[PDB]
Ligand binder design. Structure first.
Ligand code: CU
Ligand code: CU
Lengths: 200, 209
């Protein structure tokens, strides 16, 4: 049933294993924050993970939605971005801490983010992004395995706890772009145009 | 017969316009800017310095055929060029080259794509005749660097980081980076006249699976 729904839209594509996993009926949130100029080949990242960062309908806004099934999830994503999109998510590895950045791929500023809520039931809180650039960041871990994670840089750097901006980056709102990674439980939908980059 | 040669190997692909251009039968520009790997990041402001002349050697890397190491070769036709490339890398490869824009100076880096350490570089010599000096690369990582210019146009350039940072004018390392050989990785860009052949594996990156 589920893949039927999917293949109707994107025939001759499977659900990617990341998404396929998130659709099954505690977590880690990466806590590390950084500036854009720290995304470069050879950057050593020591990743700090926290056990702690709809039911709360905060979708007063049309640009926000609370998806309960793959059908509704796709519906919302395409309603904002159209059909030519792919879902991505981070793939931090189980007990690895230290990674080296291999490269940094710009995914642009139009996307939909979906956060898998920690309930047993498949539930995602989905919303559009604004004033923000997304990146895909391939990395190699200490044990030699290669993976990748999604980073988000907020450039309208307002509307956040000035204290944490200061804590992490010794800066206060409005001035400079603050970036952080997303956890494996997030899905981000992105246009195919962005991904192709040079190749299209 | 030109495209026949190509389409025989890669059917339902054209020669890409950059390569197509380089295969046509004076002076060019060599970018002179050098940098460290940690300067390749989103939002880096690059002011590009261009020279009408290389510095002694092509940065640090043939009618004389200083090509007598086998790892080097001197290609005179698209057929020979392809032959050499595939002989070293196999068939599943693409050629890339930089596309600096005519009189632009200042660019912002959008992103940085790792193409790995296996590749073949081909430099189009300045003869009327189609001639390239081709060689394999070693102790070096290649990158594709998308950029937006001051005038708003988007393009991309190839960068090369030498990590076995030997085998170069220590003078220029010092001039540009106030450093001498052996210590740290030195990077620079390639001119629009270079072609680099790269495996498809590298390019796909994540999108392999
Ligand atoms: Cu954020
Ligand atoms: Cu070089």
């Amino acid at each position: 049933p589920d893949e039927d729904y999917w293949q109707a839209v994107w025939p001759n594509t499977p659900i990617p294993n990341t998404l396929k996993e998130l659709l099954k009926p505690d977590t880690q949130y990466p806590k590390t924050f950084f500036f854009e100029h720290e995304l470069f080949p050879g950057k050593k990242m020591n990743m700090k993970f926290s056990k702690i960062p709809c039911v709360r309908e905060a979708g007063k806004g049309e640009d926000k939605y609370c998806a309960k099934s793959l059908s509704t999830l796709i519906g919302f994503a395409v309603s904002k971005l159209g059909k030519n999109i792919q879902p991505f998510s981070s793939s931090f590895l189980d007990k690895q801490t230290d990674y080296t950045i291999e490269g940094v791929h710009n995914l642009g500023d139009k996307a939909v983010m979906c956060h898998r809520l920690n309930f047993q039931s498949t539930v995602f809180y989905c919303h559009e992004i604004h004033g923000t650039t997304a990146y895909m960041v391939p990395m190699v871990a200490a044990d030699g395995r290669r993976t990748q994670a999604l980073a988000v840089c907020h450039h309208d750097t307002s509307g956040m706890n000035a204290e944490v901006l200061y804590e992490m980056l010794k800066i206060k709102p409005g001035t400079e772009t603050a970036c952080h990674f997303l956890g494996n439980k997030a899905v981000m939908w992105v246009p195919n145009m962005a991904v192709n980059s040079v190749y299209n």
